[PDB]
């Protein structure tokens, strides 16, 4: 009974249950799965292109440090005319922060606008307060 959020036509956000739900992965046209929890199995190894990046949902984790590895893989799915599911465990903090940061990086949209888009798509998000503050500061130097 998971419910993924649609962030872009090619970018979904969800939980480990979504990642383990072959019926809905197929309905949703998923081609790529980006697993950004810790210790969640990749259940359908022959069926999807996977990338896994271990992340702990703790305020002392620097979510910014995982961005290039995650964002390049999201872009792979887009470039291949596919659909990536970005998921973690509950799918409300690690994976949410990755997607918000992806939007900020790829479109230079603001934190508040990216956060609002993602929460409207997936109303359960609630990133840890460390991730929140990290995302607020992200690319302030660049944007000037």
UniProtKB/Swiss-Prot annotation:
Enzyme class: hydrolase
Domain called Tyrosine-protein phosphatase: residue spans: 3-144
Reported tissue expression: Expressed in the heart, lung, liver, and pancreas. The expression level in the pancreas is the highest.
Reaction equation(s) it catalyzes: O-phospho-L-tyrosyl-[protein] + H2O = L-tyrosyl-[protein] + phosphate; O-phospho-L-seryl-[protein] + H2O = L-seryl-[protein] + phosphate; O-phospho-L-threonyl-[protein] + H2O = L-threonyl-[protein] + phosphate
Active site: 88 (phosphocysteine intermediate)
Gene Ontology molecular function: any one: protein kinase inhibitor activity
Superkingdom as given in the UniProt entry: Eukaryota
EC numbers on record: 3.1.3.16, 3.1.3.48
Annotated family: Belongs to the protein-tyrosine phosphatase family. Non-receptor class dual specificity subfamily.
Function field: Has a dual specificity toward Ser/Thr and Tyr-containing proteins.
Name of the protein this chain belongs to: Dual specificity protein phosphatase 19
Lineage: Eukaryota, Metazoa, Chordata, Craniata, Vertebrata
Full-protein interval shown: 65 to 206 of 217
